[PDB]
């Protein structure tokens, strides 16, 4: 065999079957969404590091991530992301 390389194949596929059970996906588009999730993850991660620097915070919390979302994400994307993450963090807080 070879070394296992982490990718986002199965999670994107689960989410796809959540939104579209009936369809397929090309591997080229799959690599594009891998690049997408890695790129946006890097943008938000760097922005959260910037704000943790600005507030002199040694720890990046969901407050910082929410601030970075409100910075980068436009308008309704930002507020529904806030709603989704808030619902998720309440469910995880309630386990």
Q: Which residues make up the interface to DNA (CB under 7 A)?
A: 1-11, 13, 24-27, 52, 56-59, 61
9 binds, among another protein, a copy of itself, DNA, none (CB under 5 to 8 A by kind): DNA
Burial of 64 (0-12, 13-18, 19+ CB in 10 A): buried
Query: Using CB under 8 A as the criterion, what x/- string covers residues 1-20 for binding another protein?
Result: ----xxxx--xx-xxx-xxx
Residue 87 is a binding residue for a copy of itself (CB under 8 A): yes
CB of residue 41 vs another protein: minimum separation in angstroms? 7
User: 67: closest CA among 78, 75, 58, 80?
Assistant: 78
Rounded CA gap, 70 and 84, in Å? 13
Burial of 48 (0-12, 13-18, 19+ CB in 10 A): buried
Residue 83 is a binding residue for a copy of itself (CB under 8 A): yes
Residue 38 is a binding residue for a copy of itself (CB under 8 A): no
Binding site for a copy of itself (CB under 8 A): 18-19, 21, 83, 86-87, 90
């Amino acid at each position: 065999k070879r070394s296992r390389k982490e990718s986002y194949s199965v999670y994107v596929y689960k989410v796809l079957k959540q939104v579209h059970p009936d369809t397929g996906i090309s591997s080229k588009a799959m690599g594009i969404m891998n690049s997408f999730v890695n790129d946006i993850f890097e943008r938000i991660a760097g922005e959260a590091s910037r704000l943790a620097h600005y507030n002199k915070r040694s720890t990046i919390t969901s407050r910082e991530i929410q601030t970075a979302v409100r910075l980068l994400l436009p308008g309704e994307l930002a507020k529904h992301a806030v709603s989704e993450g808030t619902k998720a963090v309440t469910k995880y807080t309630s386990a």
